[PDB]
Amino acid sequence: TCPFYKKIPGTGFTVDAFQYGVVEGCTAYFLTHFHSDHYAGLSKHFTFPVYCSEITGNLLKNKLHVQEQYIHPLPLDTECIVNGVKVVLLDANHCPGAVMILFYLPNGTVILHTGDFRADPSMERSLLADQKVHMLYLDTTYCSPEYTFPSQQEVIRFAINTAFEAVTLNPHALVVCGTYSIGKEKVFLAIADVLGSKVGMSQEKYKTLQCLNIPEINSLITTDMCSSLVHLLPMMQINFKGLQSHLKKCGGKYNQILAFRPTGWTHSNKFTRIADVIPQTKGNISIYGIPYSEHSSYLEMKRFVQWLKPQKIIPTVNVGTWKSRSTMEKYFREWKLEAGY
Ligand code: NI
């Protein structure tokens, strides 16, 4: 049964609610982004209207085989009427195709659902600037002050410089990047660009990348692994055993691997600066954990909410424990007392 924090009051609408069967009273199912915890339940047998971005709709059609007649893609930054209710989709600064949804209720209430997002000051000059928001359904993944991490730009600077140094010292090194979902494509695209290489990957991953409207993508990726010195592999294979095995496969074209695991936050963030990050090494294999996040840090979250000044906050992440919920409620009250709303 569908939890309350997935229902939009005063509408027939749900958000990211595909794993509960037919939801009573739902006339339109919104999908914020193509991550498995959010799409869980969709397939070619789904026959209700799905509302989403163009990119998300490309992935629904090609990867999950949802029939075309039930996919309703909306343009971003554009007032649209869905089942008699004005909505707007906004870029969430998460993975490709990810949106926040603004709902203008018939009674005058305005609701923002962030989906998953990485708050940014650029959001303070979207269509959010133009009116008041009563209720915020908030991605609270990293809602605690211990969650610090660098900008995406500093992380990519570290990765490009690390990869370029290693391959210039040893032209026979291979770079490997881990993946298990869409998102974080800048990691492997930026490294391949500095090296003058395409990114090599499986046919299934190539298929997924081809749904993403990334400009000049045919120039950047390939299924011909052997022509490429940046390879993508499943995240599970980014360990010394998995990488040793991969190095066998290239037929002694390569004699060293440098591998990247973009994680979110890890507690090496509470002690180490990005500048100071070092790999784990075994023989001719090194593995770097790099803190590339597509969710808000605590400080970014706090700045967004203190700017928006919502009347009520409904968390959408970490809601399963009383300790989590109490911690998050305490920070919401601090923010409101400090800013004066
Ligand atoms: Ni996500």
Side-chain angles (χ1 to χ4, degrees), residues 1-23 25-203 205-215 217-240 242-247 249-269 271-281 283-311 313-341:
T1 67
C2 188
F4 73 101
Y5 68 79
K6 300 180 177 273
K7 289 186 190 174
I8 308 295
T11 69
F13 305 153
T14 57
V15 180
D16 301 346
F18 301 87
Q19 62 167 301
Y20 304 107
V22 181
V23 179
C26 190
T27 55
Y29 294 74
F30 285 79
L31 183 57
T32 64
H33 70 293
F34 195 78
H35 280 164
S36 62
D37 277 0
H38 299 260
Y39 68 72
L42 272 168
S43 71
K44 71 160 75 175
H45 309 294
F46 201 80
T47 54
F48 297 92
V50 179
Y51 288 85
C52 62
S53 68
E54 174 181 356
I55 288 163
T56 299
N58 299 337
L59 291 157
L60 289 181
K61 179 195 168 158
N62 290 286
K63 300 290 292 191
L64 299 186
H65 310 293
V66 179
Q67 298 164 50
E68 195 134 67
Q69 79 178 117
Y70 306 102
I71 306 165
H72 300 257
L74 311 172
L76 301 186
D77 300 320
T78 303
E79 295 180 324
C80 294
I81 306 307
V82 174
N83 296 357
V85 178
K86 182 159 73 167
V87 304
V88 170
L89 298 188
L90 308 164
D91 201 273
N93 190 38
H94 185 53
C95 64
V99 301
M100 314 191 288
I101 312 158
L102 249 198
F103 299 94
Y104 292 83
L105 262 48
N107 72 7
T109 304
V110 177
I111 291 174
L112 177 59
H113 193 303
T114 65
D116 287 340
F117 87 141
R118 185 164 184 177
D120 192 76
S122 68
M123 294 173 176
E124 300 166 21
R125 300 167 277 285
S126 61
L127 306 197
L128 289 176
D130 303 46
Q131 85 292 280
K132 178 193 179 53
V133 172
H134 300 84
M135 309 184 80
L136 179 63
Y137 285 65
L138 179 60
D139 168 15
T140 42
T141 299
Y142 293 124
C143 189
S144 189
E146 74 269 30
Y147 301 115
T148 66
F149 34 73
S151 65
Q152 288 176 167
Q153 193 276 332
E154 295 170 71
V155 177
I156 288 301
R157 176 95 278 205
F158 173 88
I160 282 169
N161 286 2
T162 300
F164 181 78
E165 173 174 313
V167 174
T168 298
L169 292 170
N170 181 193
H172 296 278
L174 174 64
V175 177
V176 182
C177 295
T179 191
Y180 40 31
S181 61
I182 64 169
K184 307 187 187 186
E185 288 82 6
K186 192 70 176 172
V187 180
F188 53 85
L189 298 170
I191 291 167
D193 174 78
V194 79
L195 300 174
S197 180
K198 292 188 172 184
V199 186
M201 60 194 70
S202 68
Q203 292 184 254
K205 184 75 182 177
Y206 184 91
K207 180 181 184 185
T208 300
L209 296 184
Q210 286 292 163
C211 300
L212 310 181
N213 294 345
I214 291 172
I217 196 69
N218 298 326
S219 68
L220 324 164
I221 59 172
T222 188
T223 55
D224 182 9
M225 305 283 303
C226 287
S227 70
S228 159
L229 57 152
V230 182
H231 296 175
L232 303 190
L233 289 185
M235 196 74 87
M236 291 192 77
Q237 200 166 0
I238 312 308
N239 50 70
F240 296 117
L243 294 164
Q244 278 169 209
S245 178
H246 187 69
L247 194 46
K249 286 154 212 156
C250 305
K253 201 163 195 295
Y254 310 110
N255 68 0
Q256 182 184 351
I257 285 172
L258 182 130
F260 296 92
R261 293 175 352 76
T263 66
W265 177 91
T266 67
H267 187 66
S268 30
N269 274 282
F271 304 133
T272 326
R273 275 178 148 62
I274 183 72
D276 302 317
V277 161
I278 66 150
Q280 282 199 230
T281 294
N284 62 343
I285 303 183
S286 292
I287 303 174
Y288 286 85
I290 60 172
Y292 192 92
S293 182
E294 294 182 339
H295 297 272
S296 310
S297 72
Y298 172 85
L299 291 171
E300 290 165 353
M301 191 192 301
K302 177 176 181 278
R303 175 185 170 116
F304 180 82
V305 176
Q306 287 181 310
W307 170 86
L308 194 68
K309 305 181 170 50
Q311 293 181 357
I313 305 173
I314 301 167
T316 63
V317 187
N318 305 306
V319 301
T321 76
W322 299 113
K323 179 164 174 217
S324 284
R325 286 189 154 291
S326 184
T327 293
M328 292 182 296
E329 289 180 6
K330 288 172 35 255
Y331 290 131
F332 306 148
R333 183 59 63 187
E334 292 180 11
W335 301 349
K336 180 176 160 81
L337 291 170
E338 182 191 15
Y341 54 102

